[PDB]
Symmetry: D2
Subunit: 455 residues, 4 copies
C-alpha cells in the first residue's frame, strides 16, 4: 500500500518556520513569485525535485574519492561504464546538467527550418530547439492535456499525429522526435513501452531520428512494471535498458533520477554525431573527460544511477508522492490525475474558480500556500508557458497548476501530512486568493524572475 | 499529538531489504540470538539508542574541522565552553564514552567500605562503584518496580530511604549519591526537578556529595517541561541548567543525548577533585585535552549537545517513542508503562504466557520479531541476567522484556509502523511462538554470543 | 628565497608508484599521447592547474553545509557577499566554470560586426566572441611574443595599438576590451596596475566597455605587490579590489585562483546588463541563484576566494612555480622567460633541436618525461594547434612548448625536484629523443585522442 | 637518498605563527610545560606522532560508510579480518587507544608479585604493570641507554639479562616479556628479527608468555628490510607477519602506525585469555564489537593498517625523519643516534652543558625552541621518567632529550628545513636557557600537567 522508507537516515538538516507576518513580507519582497524567496525561510521546499535529492552514504564515500584529473579520471570511467551498462548507449558525454546536454543536441541534430515533434514540451528543451531554427510540434495524445482524466500512460505519443506530421511535412523536414519519460508538464505521466516500440518502428521506416529526454526515466520504468501487462516480472534495470533500445540517443539530467545535486550527460550511438559532440562540449561545458563536472560529481552520479534501479527505492519514491495525492483527493482538493512519479499538481482552475487565466491564479495559489503553511511550490501554468514568438500573446495551456515537487529521499510521510493538512485548510476559504499582473517580464523564460503585483 | 520531524533528510544509509525467507536463514545462522545478527542484514536496528544517532550537517561540518593536536585542541575548548554554558559545571574532562567517566569518578570519590546510593543502577556504573570497594544501596521510590503502574516521574528517589541510610550508616560512610536521569532500568523513567531539589537539600545538610548520571538528561528535561507544573514556560536549556545546579558533578555519555556516535565526559565543581581527575584521566583515556577522543569527535559532541536543547527536536524524539508505545497499547500488546524517553519495553512474560522463563520467551520473541519484520531488538531478561557465580543457576529477573530502543533521528513514523504492525500480528498468534534452549552458552557475557534452537 | 608551505597536510591522495618499465607500457597503450594516460597511472599530474586544486579543511566543512535549494540558497548569498566585498562589482551571476560566463558575456555585450580587443586570447574566450559576430584584435605589447625576453609585466596592453584601433574603426564599432590577468598564452605573464589604469582612462573617454578575464587575478596581484613600485605595503586583497575598479565586469573561473575543482561566475556593475544576464543564464547554466553549480560548490568557491587573498599562500604558490623554473634554468634547460604564475613552459623547439616541428618534439618530449619520472605534462605545440579547416595543413605555432602546469596546494618542493631532475637528465641526453608520427588522427580535437609511434 | 612524498596533497589545513612576544607569554601562561599550550598558536606541532596523522582519501571514504551498529558492524568485521590477515593473531579486541589495551592485558596476565621484563619501558605501559602488582625489569641491552652510540637495532633485548632474570627469579614468577617495536624512549630504535626469534625460543623453553607493544611495528619492519641481512627481498607485510609469529599477543595503538587519529586493539591467540578479555573490555571500553570506537573509526584503522604496508610510504616516512636528523647533525647539533623511525631526539645534556639534570634542561630546551621557532616539542627526560615508588626520588635516566616527533603524512621537507634552521640558530647561543623547578607535581605521570618555575 504505502511502504516505509527503504533506507535509514544517515544525517539530517534542521528546518524552521518564520511567522505568517514575516512570510507575508517575504512574498511581498519577492514580488509574489515563489522563485525569489530565500531558502532559510522555508520549512518544506517543494519547489523542484531537481538537484534537491539526498545522497546516500555510498555516494558520499564516492565524494571523498574524487579524481579531479582533467583527463583520464577514474570517476569519468566509472560513469561511462555505468551509463553504457544500464542505458545501453554507445557513446557518453558528461555535461554539467540537463540543459547543457540539450544545448549540444539541438546544435548537432537540427537544421534551420526543420520540425521537432515530442510528447508535449519543456521550457528549456523547447527554447534550445527554437533557438536553433526548429519549429516545435506537440504530438502527445489529447488526453494528456486534460488534468482530471484518470487514464494510464498519459505521456504516450499519438501515433496518428506523428503519422500526419510525416505526411504533411515530409520525413526529411523532421529533425528528430523528442520523447520525454516521464512527461513533466502533463503531471509527471509515464510513457508505455508499447508506445516506444511503435514510435521506433514508425520513425525507422522513414529514417527519422528519435532522442529521449531521460530525466525521470526510472520513475517511468516503475509505472511500466506496475501497470503495463507483461512487465510485472521484469526488474527496473531490465525495463530501463529496453526503453533505451528504442532510441538513438538521449539527454539526461542526473539532478533528477540519478539522485544527485548536480550533473547530466548526453548519450548517442552514432560515431559522427559523437565526434561532433566532443568538439562542441569543449566550447560550452569543458573537456569530454569531465564535461563541466568535478570528478567527485561524476562519481556520485555513477553510483546514484545504480541505486535508482533498486525496486524498493523507486516504489517508495512514487508511492510517497501518491500518498500526498490520495490524501488531498480524499478531502476534495482538485488535483491532476493520475498523480505522476515526482510531484502532485494542484489544479488552480478548480481551486480558484473566481480567478481567470489572465489573472494568473496558479502564481497566486502558490503564494498563499507558503503564507499559510510555509511550503514552497512552483507555478506551472500560463506564466511558465511563455509567450508566442510571432504574435506576442500568452501561450494558453489547458493546464494551470501549482506543482508540489518531492525531492528524493528528503521528506517523510509525516511531512506529506503537514503539506496535505495545510492545503486542505486553505481549500476551505479558497476565495481569498487575489489575482496578479506583470510588473517585470523577461524576454525569455519569464517565470524564473518575473515580478507581479496584485490586481 | 504527534509532530512531524523538525528536520529533513540530508543523507541516507541504504539497506538491502531481504525477504522473510532469507531473514529466517540469517536468524538461524545467528543461533536465534539477535546479538549475533550482522548489521548488514537488518532493516531497522532497535538494539540500542547508544551511539547509533544520526548527526546533522552542522556536526559533519565540524567533523571536517578536527584539530587533532595532542594538547590544546580547539575542539576541546569548544566542548569545554559548551558544557560550562549548558550544564553550568566548573570543570570538564572528556572521556571516550560514559563508562570511561564512571571509572574515573568511582576511583576519585569512593573510599573502600563506603556506601553509594542511587535511584536504581546501571551495569557499568555499579561495577566501578563495587570494584572500588563501595556497597550499592537502591533508594528509588517503590513504585518504580511496578512495570504496569502508569504514574509520572517514576525515577524519583525515596527521600526517606535516603534519610534512613544516612541515620543507620552515617554521613561520613557515604561516598556519594548517584542520581540517574533518566532511569534506565525502570524503562527510561524521568526524575522530577522537585526531587532533585529535595535530594540536594538533604545531602548538603550532611556534607554528602551528589553526582548525576546525565546520560539521558535532555529526555528528562522534556518530561519536566511537559508534566511538571511550573516549567511549561521554561526552555529545555533552562531546565537542564537548573537540574545540574543541584549536583556536584556528573558522568555523561554523549553517545545518547549529545546526538553522536562516540564520546562522553566528566564534570565537576571541586578544584581538588578536578586536579585529581586530570592526573587519573591520562592513565585510562588520554590527555585532559582530548580524553580518548579524536578532535573531530569532541567537536561533533559540542555541536550535538547544543542541538539537543531545541524543543522541537526533543519533543519529536520523545513522542516518536510514545507513538510506538501508544500503537502497541491500543492493540492490547503488553508493554512497560509509562513509556520512557528512549525505548518501548515489551513484557515478554505476558506476551508469551504459554512459555516459562527457562524457555527464554524474551529471546524467542526477539527472534520472531526479526524474522517477521527485519527489526532487531534486545533481549532484557533471563539470558542477559547471567548466571550466579557460585551456584551456577540462572539469575531470575522480575522483568522479562524485549527492548525496542530508538536511535535519535534515524527512523520515521513509517518505520515505527513496521515495528508495531509486525509485533501486533505476532501478538494475535502469540500461541505459536516456540521456546528456546541453549546449544552454545559461553562462560560469561552469554547474551553476546549464545546460540539457541527451538524446543 | 623559497618559503615553506604556509599550511600542513590534512589528507592525502594515494598513488601507486609504478616503475619505469610499467610506465613505458602505459605510455605505449596511450599511443605516446599524455592526454590518453589514465589518472591512476600518473604520479605527478601537471597537465593543468584548472580544477585540480586541493581544498582546505574549511572548504570541506562548507561542502558539508550545502544548501541544495533551487532558488535562494544560503551558499549563493555567501558567494555573492564575498565577491562583492573582494572584487567590488555590483552584480554577480554564478556559472559552472569560466567558459560558461564567457558564453553569457559574449551574447550580452557583442553586436555582430563589432570588434573585441585584448592582450592576446584564450581558445574558449575568443570562440564565444567570434561565434557572436565579433572580430578579434590583439593589442598586447610586442614584447609578449618574445619567449626569451625576461621583462616584468609582459601582459600589458600596448596603449597605442588600442588607440590606433579606436581611430581606425570607431568607438561605436568596438564591443569591449578583454583584459586578461594573467595572460595565459604569453606563459602566465602579469599585467601592471598602471596599465589597467591607463586602459580604463582611454576607453572611458570613448564610452568603450572593459571586461576582465580574472581567471588568475590573484597571481597577477602578487606580481604587482612584488615587482610594481608603490604596492609593497598593499595587501593582496587591496590590490585585487583596485584592479577590478578599472573594469565594468569580469568573467572568472573559480577552478584556478579560487582554489576549487569546479565553479566560475560573471560580474557586472550595469543594472540593465545584469537584468539581461539573469534572463540568459537560465538558458545555459541554471537559476541566477546557483548557475549550474551545487550549493556546496558555491560555498567552497566563496571560502576559497577568501583564502586566496592570504599573502603567504599566494607567495608560496608563485615561488614554488619559480623554484621549478629556476632549477631548470640553472641547468641550461631552455624555458619560456620570465616564469609565469602557474606553469613552467619548456621550449621543445630548442630542447629537441635535432627534430623538426613535423616530428612533434613537444609531444615526444612530454612522452619521455612521463616514462622517466611519472610526470604528466601538456603538449602546447603543433599537435594542439590543429589543422587548417580549408587547406588541411598543420597550423604551425611559433611556440612549440611542453607546459608543466602546477595545481594549487597539491605538490611539494620534493615533487618539483622529481620533475626537474628527470627533465635535466633528459636534457643531458636529449639527442636520443625520437620523433613521433601519427598512427591515428581524429578529425577534430586531435590533441585529445591522437595516437603516435616513434620514427 | 631522500625520496619525494609517495602521495599527493588532497586537502590542507592553514597554520600561522604568533610573535615571539606572545609566544613568551604563552610559555609563561603554560608554566613552562609544552603540554599546556594551545594548538592554534603553534606553527609546526611536533609534540607527538600519536593520533596526529593525516588520513588518505580512501580512509575518508571509509569514514562516510561508518556502520554504527552496537554489534555486527561491517566495520568491525573489516578490522578483524585485516588484523588477522596482516598480524596473524587468532583473536582481536578493539579498544579506544593503546593504553586501553594495556589496561586489559595487565589485568589479564599479571599476578601480584610477578615480574614483567621488557626492552625499556613506557610511561603508561609501566603504570598499568605496576598498578596490577608487577615489578618492572629492564632487559634491553645497555647500549640502548647511550644516546650517541650509533649501532643498529638498539632496541634488542639482552638475552643474557633475560636469562639471568629467569634463573634468579624463576620462570613461574615472570608474568610475561613485553617486547616493544620500536622502542620509544630509546629514540625510536628497532628490534631485529633475530632477536625476536631468540627471545621466543628462550621464553618458550620455560613456558613464559611474550606480548608485543606493536605501536610502531611498521617502522620496525622497515629497519629490518633496510639493515638486517636476508630481508632485502621481503615485503613489509611479510616482515610484519613474521614478527608477530614470535609473540603470543600484542597491544596496539592504531594512533601511530595505523595512520589514524584515534583507535587501538588487543590481539591474542589463547581462547581462555580472549574469553576473559571480552568480560573486561565491556567494563572499561565497551562491547567487544566496537570497543569504545565509532564504526567509522574501526573502518579507518582497518584501511590505514593496510596502507602502512606500502613500501614507498614507510620508506619516505622514515627517511623524512632521517633528513631532519642528518641536517641537524651536519651542523653539529647533538642528537640521539641512530635516528629512530618516528622522531629526532635532541640530547639536552650536550645542548645544555651548563644545566644539570636537577635543573631540568630538556623541559627548558623545549620552551626555548617554541619561543625562537614556533615549533612544539616534547620533554623526554627526568620529568617523564617519574619518581621511584618506594624512595620518592627522581628516576634519573641517562637520556635527557627533547623529542621532535613527526606526524605521518602531515609535513614536507621544507617544513623540516624550518625546524632544522631554527634549532641550528638556537644552538649558537645555547647558554641563554634557564633551569626549571617544580611548582605543581601530579602524583603519577607528572609530566602531563606539571607546572614549573625558573631557577
Ligand atoms: C528543473 C526542472 N526540470 C528540469 C528538466 C530539464 C533540464 O534539466 P536541467 O535542469 O538539468 O538542465 C530537462 N528536461 C526536463 C524534463 C526537466 O524536467 C524542474 O522541473 O524543476
Ligand atoms: C602517545 C605516545 N605514546 C603512546 C604509546 C602508547 C599508548 O598508546 P595510546 O597513546 O594509544 O594509549 C603505548 N606504547 C607506546 C610505545 C606508545 O608510544 C607518545 O609517545 O607521544
Ligand atoms: K557507534
Ligand atoms: K587526535
Ligand atoms: K576537477
Ligand atoms: K542543487
Amino acid at each position: 500500500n504505502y511502504p516505509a522508507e527503504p533506507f535509514r537516515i544517515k544525517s539530517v538538516e534542521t528546518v524552521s518556520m518564520i511567522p505568517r507576518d514575516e512570510r507575508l513580507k517575504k512574498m511581498q519582497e519577492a514580488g509574489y513569485n515563489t522563485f525569489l524567496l530565500n531558502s532559510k525561510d522555508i520549512y518544506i521546499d517543494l519547489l523542484t525535485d531537481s538537484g534537491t535529492n539526498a545522497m546516500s552514504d555510498k555516494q558520499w564515500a564516492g565524494m571523498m574519492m574524487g579524481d579531479e584529473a582533467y583527463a583520464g579520471s577514474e570517476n569519468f570511467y566509472h560513469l561511462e561504464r555505468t551509463v553504457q551498462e544500464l542505458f545501453g548507449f554507445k557513446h557518453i558525454v558528461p555535461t554539467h546538467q540537463g540543459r547543457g546536454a540539450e544545448n549540444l543536441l539541438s546544435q548537432l541534430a537540427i537544421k534551420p527550418g526543420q520540425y521537432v515533434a515530442g510528447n508535449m514540451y519543456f521550457t528549456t528543451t523547447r527554447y534550445h530547439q527554437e533557438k536553433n531554427g526548429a519549429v516545435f510540434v506537440d504530438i502527445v495524445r489529447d488526453e494528456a492535456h486534460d488534468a482530471g482524466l484518470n487514464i494510464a500512460f498519459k505521456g504516450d505519443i499519438d501515433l496518428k499525429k506523428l503519422q500526419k506530421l510525416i505526411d504533411e511535412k515530409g520525413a526529411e523536414n523532421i529533425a528528430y522526435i523528442c520523447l520525454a519519460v516521464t512527461v513533466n508538464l502533463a503531471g509527471g505521466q509515464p510513457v508505455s513501452m508499447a508506445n516506444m516500440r511503435a514510435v521506433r518502428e514508425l520513425t525507422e521506416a522513414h529514417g527519422i531520428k528519435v532522442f529521449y529526454d531521460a530525466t525521470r526515466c526510472v520513475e517511468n520504468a516503475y509505472f511500466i512494471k506496475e501497470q503495463e501487462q507483461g512487465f510485472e516480472n521484469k526488474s527496473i534495470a531490465e525495463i530501463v535498458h529496453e526503453m533505451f533500445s528504442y532510441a538513438d540517443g538521449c539527454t539526461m539530467s542526473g539532478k533528477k533520477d540519478c539522485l544527485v545535486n548536480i550533473g547530466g550527460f548526453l548519450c548517442m550511438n552514432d560515431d559522427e554525431m559523437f565526434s561532433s559532440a566532443k568538439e562542441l562540449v569543449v566550447v560550452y561545458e569543458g573537456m569530454p573527460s569531465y564535461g563541466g563536472l568535478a570528478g567527485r560529481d561524476m562519481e556520485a552520479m555513477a553510483i546514484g544511477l545504480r541505486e535508482a534501479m533498486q525496486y524498493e527505492y523507486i516504489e517508495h519514491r512514487v508511492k510517497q508522492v501518491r500518498y500526498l495525492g490520495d490524501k488531498l483527493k480524499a478531502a476534495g482538493v482538485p488535483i491532476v490525475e493520475p498523480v505522476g512519479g515526482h510531484a502532485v499538481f494542484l489544479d488552480a482552475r478548480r481551486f480558484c474558480e473566481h480567478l481567470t487565466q489572465d489573472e494568473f491564479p496558479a502564481q497566486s495559489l502558490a503564494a498563499s500556500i507558503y503564507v499559510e503553511t510555509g511550503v514552497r511550490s512552483m507555478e506551472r501554468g500560463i506564466i511558465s508557458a511563455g509567450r508566442n514568438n510571432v504574435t506576442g500573446e500568452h501561450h494558453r495551456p489547458k493546464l494551470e497548476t501549482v506543482r508540489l515537487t518531492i525531492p528524493r529521499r528528503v521528506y517523510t510521510y509525516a511531512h506529506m501530512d503537514v503539506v496535505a493538512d495545510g492545503i486542505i485548510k486553505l481549500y476551505q476559504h479558497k476565495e481569498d486568493i487575489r489575482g496578479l499582473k506583470f510588473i517585470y517580464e523577461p524576454k525569455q523564460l519569464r517565470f524564473f524572475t518575473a515580478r507581479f503585483d496584485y490586481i
